[PDB]
Amino acid sequence: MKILIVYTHPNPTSFNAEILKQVQTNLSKEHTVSTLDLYAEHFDPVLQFNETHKRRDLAKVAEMEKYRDLVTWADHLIFIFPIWWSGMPAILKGFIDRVFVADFAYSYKKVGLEGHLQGKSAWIITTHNTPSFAMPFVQDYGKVLKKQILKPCAISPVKLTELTSIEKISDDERQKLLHKVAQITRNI
Amino acid sequence: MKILIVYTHPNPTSFNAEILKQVQTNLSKEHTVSTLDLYAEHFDPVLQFNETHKRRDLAKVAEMEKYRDLVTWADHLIFIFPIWWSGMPAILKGFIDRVFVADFAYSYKKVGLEGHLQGKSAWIITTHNTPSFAMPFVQDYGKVLKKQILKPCAISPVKLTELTSIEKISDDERQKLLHKVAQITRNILEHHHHHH
Ligand SMILES: Cc1cc2nc3c(=O)[nH]c(=O)nc-3n(C[C@H](O)[C@H](O)[C@H](O)COP(=O)(O)OP(=O)(O)OC[C@H]3O[C@@H](n4cnc5c(N)ncnc54)[C@H](O)[C@@H]3O)c2cc1C
Ligand SMILES: Cc1cc2nc3c(=O)[nH]c(=O)nc-3n(C[C@H](O)[C@H](O)[C@H](O)COP(=O)(O)OP(=O)(O)OC[C@H]3O[C@@H](n4cnc5c(N)ncnc54)[C@H](O)[C@@H]3O)c2cc1C
């Protein structure tokens, strides 16, 4: 299938960068793969609208066309990012804000939303330093992207993989998680 | 007291803009108020770090100094923003990402975090299109900023005011919402002081 990896981290030698490598090298050669590196793209995540350029025409904003096309093209999206303040780094938040717009990713129904991205699945891989025993007691941490962004847009299924206590654990332990990620990737 | 209003909306003629005007116009004159229009400032919400500019040195990033100083100065922070995808607009998320950094807003304890913004309180005003009965059930919708950002940084108390079904309701109901903001605003006072 057609695979889009949306990767979010400022540092090319980060652990996230390593996670990206595991995914890229382990995806079968039968898939066609594009990597979207938001930091490398110098992506501008600030959504602009007003009376001059109306919110209604956001799906037609030129600067965002490339990204709309990458999303439409894809069958499966893989998101890689660290948890910053319980959620997506700002550049990735604004990727959603700006690219997942009405009349593209969804449209408004009599009540609620009608998702337009049917036929697509996703995988979320996220790192954070919070212990797993604590996770039922915390808000978001990837649950927003999965349950309240991707799902309402008709993207299903959405697998969520959290790698927890990521800075407390050891290099050994981290490398076991990378191996887990590599194997999940092969099993797609 | 010293009040920092952090305002987030791209449209000067938005309903959020009118919320801002209500807050600004109704704060007691005893307060010193400063408004931070993140959009007007062309704030860059993208946190940068790498081997060159280490994460360790975020609290000394030059471009953010003006904003660190605003937070330090403030006794009370008022956040005004619309809910986009269950939370903060990317520009405001990045304000937290870049400004509320370790060795400024917080540091690491033997075990947890210690907030350093003690002695500060906050008020969050959010607007969205979701029914208010859904609020206890949805993730975030301002709860992350209140419970999982502000609070851990030792800011307290924090009041969360949700303006719900904000687009479905009538223009009259919305004006009644503005009344509510205006009146809560008037009761922002140092203890045993009245509104000037
Ligand atoms: C602004 C900000 C906000 C934060 N908010 C939250 C909060 O809401 N919740 C909380 O739980 N966390 C929070 N964090 C922490 C954050 O989620 C982590 O720092 C992140 O998940 C780690 O990923 P990284 O790629 O940045 O790690 P990195 O700093 O790059 O590396 C992490 C560790 O992995 C190691 N490593 C790198 N490569 C390898 C490898 N090949 N083999 C073995 N180990 C390796 C490193 O050397 C290091 O010890 C926040 C951090 C920031 C900067
Ligand atoms: C990218 C994006 C993501 C979104 N994600 C979600 C989702 O996660 N959750 C969901 O609930 N909503 C969400 N929304 C919608 C959003 O939260 C609302 O549009 C917003 O809260 C409204 O505030 P505003 O400043 O933008 O309103 P405006 O659109 O500017 O105004 C809204 C209404 O109030 C009116 N109004 C303006 N001034 C006055 C006044 N002086 N007196 C009386 N009426 C006035 C207007 O004329 C209009 O009818 C999303 C929107 C966007 C753009």
From TrEMBL, chain A:
Similarity annotation: Belongs to the NAD(P)H dehydrogenase (quinone) family.
GO cellular component: cytosol
Main EC class the enzyme belongs to: oxidoreductase
GO molecular function: NAD(P)H dehydrogenase (quinone) activity; nucleotide binding
InterPro entries listed in its UniProt record: Flavodoxin_fold, Flavoprotein-like_sf, NAD(P)H_dehydrogenase_qn
Residues binding FAD 1: 9, 15-16, 18, 55, 83, 85-86, 127, 129-130, 141, 167, 171
Keywords, sorted A to Z: FAD, Flavoprotein, Nucleotide-binding, Oxidoreductase
The keyword Chaperone appears for this protein: no
Pfam families cross-referenced by the UniProt entry: Flavodoxin_2
Residues that coordinate or bind FAD 2: 9, 15-16, 55, 83, 85-86, 127, 129-130, 167, 171, 175
UniProt xrefs under Gene3D superfamilies: 3.40.50.360
Annotated EC: 1.6.5.2
SUPFAM superfamilies: Flavoproteins
Name the UniProt record assigns to this protein: Oxidoreductase
Domain Flavodoxin-like fold: residue ranges: 1-181
UniProtKB/TrEMBL annotation, chain B:
Residues annotated for FAD 2 binding in this entry: 9, 15-16, 55, 83, 85-86, 127, 129-130, 167, 171, 175
Domain Flavodoxin-like fold residues, every copy: 1-181
InterPro entries per record: Flavodoxin_fold (IPR003680), Flavoprotein-like_sf (IPR029039), NAD(P)H_dehydrogenase_qn (IPR051545)
Chain residues that bind FAD 1: 9, 15-16, 18, 55, 83, 85-86, 127, 129-130, 141, 167, 171
Enzyme Commission number(s): 1.6.5.2
A cellular-component GO term for this protein: cytosol
EC top class, as a word: oxidoreductase
Keyword terms: FAD, Flavoprotein, Nucleotide-binding, Oxidoreductase
Keyword Nucleotide-binding: yes
Cross-referenced Pfam families: Flavodoxin_2
Highest taxon, organism lineage: Bacteria
Record bears the keyword ATP-binding: no
Transmembrane segments: none
Similarity comment: family membership: Belongs to the NAD(P)H dehydrogenase (quinone) family.
Protein name: Oxidoreductase
Species for this entry: Streptococcus mutans serotype c (strain ATCC 700610 / UA159)
